[PDB]
Design a protein around this ligand. Sequence first.
Ligand SMILES: *[C@@H]1O[C@H](CO[C@@H]2O[C@@H](C)[C@@H](O)[C@@H](O)[C@@H]2O)[C@@H](O[C@@H]2O[C@H](CO)[C@@H](O[C@@H]3O[C@H](CO[C@H]4O[C@H](CO)[C@@H](O)[C@H](O)[C@@H]4O)[C@@H](O)[C@H](O[C@H]4O[C@H](CO)[C@@H](O)[C@H](O)[C@@H]4O)[C@@H]3O)[C@H](O)[C@H]2NC(C)=O)[C@H](O[C@@H]2O[C@@H](C)[C@@H](O)[C@@H](O)[C@@H]2O)[C@H]1NC(C)=O
Lengths: 212, 117
Amino acid sequence: GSPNITNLCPFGEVFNATRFASVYAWNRKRISNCVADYSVLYNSASFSTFKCYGVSPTKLNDLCFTNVYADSFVIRGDEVRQIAPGQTGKIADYNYKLPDDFTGCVIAWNSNNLDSKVGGNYNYLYRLFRKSNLKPFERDISTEIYQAGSTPCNGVEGFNCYFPLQSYGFQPTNGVGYQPYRVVVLSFELLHAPATVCGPKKSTGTLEVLFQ
Amino acid sequence: SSSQVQLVESGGGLVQAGGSLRLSCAASGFPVWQGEMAWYRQAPGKEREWVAAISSMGYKTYYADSVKGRFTISRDNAKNTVYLQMNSLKPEDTAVYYCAVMVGFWYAGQGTQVTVS
Ligand SMILES: *[C@@H]1O[C@H](CO[C@@H]2O[C@@H](C)[C@@H](O)[C@@H](O)[C@@H]2O)[C@@H](O[C@@H]2O[C@H](CO)[C@@H](O[C@@H]3O[C@H](CO[C@H]4O[C@H](CO)[C@@H](O)[C@H](O)[C@@H]4O)[C@@H](O)[C@H](O[C@H]4O[C@H](CO)[C@@H](O)[C@H](O)[C@@H]4O)[C@@H]3O)[C@H](O)[C@H]2NC(C)=O)[C@H](O[C@@H]2O[C@@H](C)[C@@H](O)[C@@H](O)[C@@H]2O)[C@H]1NC(C)=O
């Protein structure tokens, strides 16, 4: 027959979501126990980045013993280079860290037309200060006052005592390096038990639905 | 290190009705054998129209009724390229043609314009 709509993989929901997470609170969606939605399509015009590391994107079709994690968030154009193995900087250090041996794909696109507004969109936040670098795929959503000097802060902001999250200000007139970019990181979770719903790499005949 | 994932169509152009054209689709970042690949076309007025497809890991081909007998899809795994052979072109074959691969979702190229007088 045909799969239940509950059994279609929600890749379209990842890329087409109306709102994206702030990078410090990056969102992870597990894609599992599902088969491809043949109505979901993107082209070279959709993305400015689509790079995979150590893996073909055709692995996204193999979910019988694998889950896909789609991590998504908004950062600045000039920070997209940090969503890659072996990078350092504000995003890699304190917000979203990929491992040196990363296996998976990174997709990004310019979201100026949705995420910037006249006078600035301030709803996207990043972590600016942290006592140590994030481990790969670590997530920090704490909001403790950061002690930048030797004097303890005792929970009050001042010189050397800073609230650690700060807002991007996305204006449509910003240069492209300061415009917002939506980012989707696809990685794989190897499983020990077979999926209830999935499909083989070799075609089973689903292509006929495009000509119906 | 990284590999960019990209599909680049080429070979479009202007031909008078009854003529032929062979479109090419150079793929990057995945082996074309490992994916279901397909051609669709984008007509000025109309929505997306799938015209031809070939199986993952196999040779079974599919075609839109509107192009059966006229178009042939094929795959050169050594050149990592897919082709669309278009014969006996009719003026309502005029559209921008895209190649695409199923990677969880369809991912398509940049398009190549085909105009049939
Ligand atoms: C889920 O998202 C899909 C993908 O969105 C894109 O990708 C994401 C990742 C972001 O990067 C987005 O910014 C981006 O849009 C949606 O599909 C996309 O929809 C948009 C808008 O509907 C569509 O863009 C249009 O494309 C046509 C065709 O462009 C080619 O052809 C012309 C000649 O015909 C040529 O000149 C071009 O160079 C291209 O080669 C274009 O004509 C449109 O122009 C209009 O808008 C621009 C805005 O800049 C304006 O300047 C023009 O003057 C004119 O008004 C416009 O650019 C994307 O092509 C399309 N992408 C794909 C892969 O399909 C998807 O939207 C839904 O499907 C669409 C087909 C459309 O019907 C939408 O209304 C639907 O909602 C979305 N899905 C849902 C459910 O929301």
